[PDB]
Design a protein around this ligand. Structure first.
Ligand SMILES: O=C(O)Cc1c[nH]c2ccccc12
Ligand SMILES: O=C(O)Cc1c[nH]c2ccccc12
Lengths: 105, 105
């Protein structure tokens, strides 16, 4: 319907594969195997990017850090700030409010 | 290139930033917010890569697919298979045993 069968079939396969990762990691957390699982599946630079993205989201929500501090401290230029801001705007409000509670105390 | 206090301090700061993401995601799984959280923090191509890496690891552990089949079906050339094989060999025994259990049924 929304996609032609070739595109739909590939998208469904990718969706199943993504959820398989999500469920594997879900159970790894319950078994205290999440740290080595994430070391296996994410490269060091990918893990660093995730740590830095959390700080970018935190500082965007907090509102105190300047654009130039975002670049110099977190490597986030104008375009990245605009993309990150867009992701926050697109997220469910419930997630955004939860992030505020957890990341901002 | 023996580590200096400067480099050690920055490495520990990056480590704490990574653990902060890990804990944030742990708590999102507990509140059923992991799916929107992962859409915020990972780009689509990064999510696809994680889904494909799970299949690569599964098929490496199962040992049935050939190198040509891994390339054709999963996009994993010989260099990536060598890296992935090395990550599995370096994983802690508890993780390798668990992955064999859950990925191979
Ligand atoms: O080595 C890479 O290019 C990325 C990567 C990270 N973890 C992996 C597990 C299996 C296959 C590839 C990867
Ligand atoms: O847009 C990017 O360059 C990657 C990215 C994904 N989620 C983010 C959240 C905050 C800042 C950057 C990103």
């Amino acid at each position: 319907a929304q996609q032609s069968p070739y595109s739909a079939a590939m998208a469904e396969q990718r969706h199943q594969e993504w959820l398989r990762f999500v469920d594997l990691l879900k159970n790894a957390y319950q078994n205290d195997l999440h740290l080595p699982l994430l070391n296996l599946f994410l490269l060091p630079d990918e893990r660093e990017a995730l740590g830095t993205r959390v700080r970018i989201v935190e500082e965007l929500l907090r509102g105190e850090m300047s654009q130039r501090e975002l670049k110099n401290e977190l490597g986030a230029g104008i375009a990245m700030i605009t993309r990150g801001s867009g992701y926050l705007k697109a997220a469910p409000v419930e997630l955004r409010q939860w992030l505020e509670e957890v990341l901002l105390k």
